[model samples]
Every structure is written in C-alpha cells, then in structure tokens.
Target: PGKSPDSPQWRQHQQDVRNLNQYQTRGAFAYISDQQKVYARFFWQQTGQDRYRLLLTNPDGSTELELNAQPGNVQLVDNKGQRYTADDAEEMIGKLTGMPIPLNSLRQWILGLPGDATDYKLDDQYRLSEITYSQNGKNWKVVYGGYDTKTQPAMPANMELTDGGQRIKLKMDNWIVK
Candidate 1:
C-alpha cells in the first residue's frame, strides 16, 4: 500500500480514488469545503460498541456526528444535544446547515483504534509513531512529534494511509487542538 503520489499523473490517481469514494470510511480529521470550509474531527473505538464521533466546528456553530455498529445511519447531534439523521452520514450534516460535513469525503477523519490519544508511542523525546488501519484500506504508519511533545498534546506527525498508487497524506499542526 506504499506508493508515491509524486508523479505528475497523481491528479489522475486522485480522481480515480475520488471516484471510488463509496469505499471511504471513518478515520482522520480534516477541514472540508462544501459551500463553505469547516473543521472536522473524528474519534473511533474498534472494540465494544466500536463507536465513532465526528465534531464539526465552524463559524456558524458546531455539530457532533456519531454512528453505531449497524453502520449506514449517521446521527448528528448539536452541541446542545439536538439529534438528526440522514441516508448518508456526511450528506446529512451537509444538508442540515448548508455547510458541507461529508464524513465520507474526509480522508483523514478516523482516529486510531484504541480511541485514546495517550496510547500513542514515543520513540524519542520528540517523535511518536504508530500503526493504524482504515476500514477501506490496510494498516499504515502515522508519525508525529517535535514541538508537539513540548507544547501541544502528542498527535500525528503525518498520517500515511494508502501507500501504493493511492498514496494519501494528512499533515497537520499540533496547534489545531491547542
């Protein structure tokens, strides 16, 4: 699954992957643009209920998105606990507030399996790396550290999801959460 998207042909690869969008699942956190840009975060638990929560923060307001094991149905709860449902999880959030909340479109929306960020392993005083898996893809490497160790909480240095012809990168700032 380790391929370089360095080719100028990478755009085509992106389109191909984008076309296979239905296979996309929960993992990674990101900011997406529908009509407007929105910041979204997701956390997943592999065992027990294997639950997932999506938090979308925007200028207008914020929403929490969750899905249970049954899978297809996605429920949206506002910060106030109001709930909503739609045929698809992402589309539902997009529909509710005119802003796009495509959980499916989020390439980096899923959090690692254990559900707690503290489980991440640190190799040196400044670097942390871990193995993780996304539902549609195989296991991949995620690394993060440096200023994160001293300043913000430990997050990922970079998340490497697909490594073959479908390489994906989700680089982030530790300050986003700080």
Candidate 2:
C-alpha cells in the first residue's frame, strides 16, 4: 500500500470521486450522424426529478423539434406545429431520429454516469470511456470522450453509441448548467 491518508494524490482521488457522485448538469447538445452530418441541435433543461425539456433547433437557429418528457409520458412538437405523444420517450425520440435513441441512458452517459445496470470502463480522470450492455437481445456499446469542463458537472463533449450494426454519434458545442 503506497497510499496514505494525508497524500495529495489521495486527496485528489477523493475529490474526483466526490465530483462523480454529486454530478448534475444540463446544456445544449448537437446530435450528429456517423458521417459527421449535424442532424439536430438542441438545448436541454432539467426540470428536477428526471424530467426535462429539449428544444431542438436547426443550424440557423430555427426551432425544429420540442420535446418534454418524464418517466412515463413524452410530448413532442415539430417545426410544422405537429404534435405527437407517446408513453415512452425513447421510442418517440427513436421515431424522430430515425434510429433508436436511448434518451435516459444517454442523459446519464453524457454526465459521465452509468445510466443502467451495466459494466463500464472509466478513464484516468474518472470519466466514462466505454460502456457495454445488452438490450432487446442485442449487445450495445458506447464510447465517450472530449470532456468539456465548462459545465458544473463537466459533461462529455462527444459520445458514440453502437447498437449492433447501427452507430450514432453526438457532439456538444455548448453547455449551460443551472
């Protein structure tokens, strides 16, 4: 045991753990395709108790999709003023994005926290590097990097998810946590 309670490295390690355990943040994010195409940009605001609203927009600052969701209900409104409701938020986002969007898990993943009961690997600074999980009889993997420390919890700047043969990537350009 080369560690002591009074060691500076030990204190830093404790602080890192504290940061992860108490992590909480929200911000604007960009959902990009695997080919580097920007699909949508959105500002997400956490409304306490796992509830949030996502105001998705076009690159030119035009509103495209607005979504408000909680644990069981989700409401989405498109740029054309068409509204849709669903019992599952992830399913609705999947329909919107043309792919499965694990909204809940992604929220946690972006915050560098494990969203589900799965095995994950952490980087040197306690950031999530990779996550492996099984869903609907399929194996899924998520890779994370490009951390932005501008937020209170310091969310991930980039994330990539691989679900069987499908891959989705997201890059966050700005973060506003309150």
Candidate 3:
C-alpha cells in the first residue's frame, strides 16, 4: 500500500520535518534579571560554521565590547580597545555576565534548537517547549517560549535556562535573518 500524497495529515507531517531543519538567525540579544534589569546586550552575527561576531554593549549603550569567536579561538576587544585571548575573554565575560558564556549553546538555543544532544519536549505547534540535558556534570532544564512568528521559521523570543541554583534568562529583542 502506497502512502496517500493528498492526505492532509501527511502534508502536515512533511511540513513539520522541513521546519525542524530551518532554524537559523542573527540578532540583537539581552540577558536580563527576573526583576527586568538588563545585565548585558549584544548584537550577534553568524558567519560560517560556529563562527560569529558579538558586539556587546553596556546597559546604557555607551560602552562597546567586540569579540570574534571561531571553532577553537575567541578574541575580544574592550571599550578601551584592549584585546583579550580566549581564556581571558572567557573569564571577563563570565565576570561581567555573572554566568559562564556558552557561546555555541546560546546561539543554538536562541533559534529554538537544542544546543547539545538531549531529550526535549515540543509544544503542539512543534516548537521547542522544554529541553533537559546535562552539561559540565550538572543537569539543566531550559524552557522556551515567547515565539515571534514575524520572522521566517519563527524563533523563541525568550528562554530560561536553569542548572542547580543557577538560572539565566535570555531575550532576543530583534532577529535578523539572512
């Protein structure tokens, strides 16, 4: 017996498979406090592979911190034009954000994809609703919501990630896709 090409359910299932592979975005993002205090803002531009440029700015938007991250190397330049290597950049960003900056994970999760191999839950609309995974020897629960359908393929406007007592909320205020 052949599958019915004209079946509505079959067509819908096909579309879901297509959407799963279509998550790609570039954007301006903010990491904020539960009280709505903005800790930092960054403009993220994805280039190739896992390479991207991040333009971090102060909450007042006066100071700019730029960084370029590739597969194994991360380079940073501060507001005063001071440069930092990968290790230093990691430490500085951690201190500034109060959380270790997981660049690759942030990039994936913002687009509504799991950043690592993990089990996840999808909403009725087929968007990622929650993900459970372990990283750095600890369990993490990430809940995604606030979808902005204005963009093609759509994106999660807000994400909350929790590991043990650590919780971080990321908001994508604007999305730019290419």
Candidate 4:
C-alpha cells in the first residue's frame, strides 16, 4: 500500500527537513558539461549550534572547493581535512587569493536540489513555504501548504555524478548520505 501522509514515515520526513536547517553542511559540486554545467552536492554535520563543516566537490577533482562559514570568517574544514577561508576555493589553486560562492547561492543549489542531488522530496506540509532567488542563470519558485506531497521523490538519495560532480566527501555532524 502507498504510504500515508500522516504515517510515521511522513512525519519523520518533515521533522528531518526542519532539523536540517539547524545543521551545518559540507558542499560539493561536479562539472556536468562544458557549458559550465555544475552539479553541486552538500553534506553537513549538526554539531550543535550553527557551527558545522561544509564540503564541495567537482568532477575534475583537480582542485579543492572551499567556502567561508557563517557568523565568523574562520576557516571551515572538509572531510579530507582541507580548509577554506572564503566561500569557495581558489580558482587556479595555490593562488594567493580566491572567490567565495555566496551563501545564498549555495543554499539555493543545495535546498533546491540542483544537479543530481535528487532523492528525498519535500513534504507537503512543509511545502517550500517560501522561496525567492535571483542569480545570473539561476531562478526558483516554491510554495507551501498541502498534504504529504513530493516533487522528485522517486529519485534516489544517493546521487550518481558525472565527470563534473563530487563524491566520497565528508563533514562534521551530519553526512550527506546519512
């Protein structure tokens, strides 16, 4: 039988998502196409409070992707023990300076389930609730209020990335796949 929206599984789903916001995640990305098609992945650890590790990876695995944690400009560590003082990592690597991906963009990519990071679906009660994003080539629309509904529920939680995606990354409190 199909699972009931009010069933334990459904309730747990909602709780999980809510708890998610409290956790810190590691972000990862992959290069899908030459068009700069980027598939980003994220993992976080709910180590109490708003402090956690964020992990990001791209297909090339050529360089490390790093980002600056919120609240403080302190360096964030990855599963591999690499550190990032900014939003993202250095473009060319070994470079004296680098650029950081805006926290909003990173949030959009992760919560929006960009690239192949498809698996779990948003619960109907938690509908996106509200979302407003504006980026160069990024846009999203979400609404809340409904029964237990899922947009991409059929997809697997474990993502299959291409040449430009990420894999085997790590974080502190919560694991992306956990």
| lDDT top scorer | 2
What local lDDT does model 2 show for residue 102? 71
* Model 4 spans with C-alpha error above 4 angstroms: 1-35, 39-42, 46-49, 58-63, 68-70, 76-102, 105-126, 135-178
Better of 2 and 3 by TM-score: 2
RMSD of each: 13.3, 5.5, 6.6, 9.9
Writing each residue's lDDT as its tens digit, candidate 4 over 1-178 gives 2333446755554455545444333434333343334444544443422344544555555323444444544465443556645533322222422222234333333332332223233444322223333434333322222222232222112222222221221112222322
Model 1, 51-155: lDDT tens per residue?
344343333535444443335555667656667765565556646665433234232323222232233343433232443434344333344322233222233
Better candidate by lDDT, 2 or 4: 2
Model 3 segments beyond 4 Å from truth? Answer: 1-38, 78-81, 87-98
Lowest lDDT 10-mer window, candidate 3?
Answer: 17-26
- What is the lDDT of every predicted structure here? 0.39, 0.65, 0.62, 0.36
For candidate 1, the lDDT comes to 0.39
Tens-digit per-residue lDDT, 1-178, candidate 3: 3343345643464354344532333334544445343455656666654577778687588546787777778777777877766644446676654555555565666666665645776665566678787767657678886777787656677788776556666667666554
The TM-score measured for candidate 2 stands at 0.71
TM-score, candidate number 3: 0.68
lDDT, residue 133, candidate 3: 78
TM-score of 4: 0.35
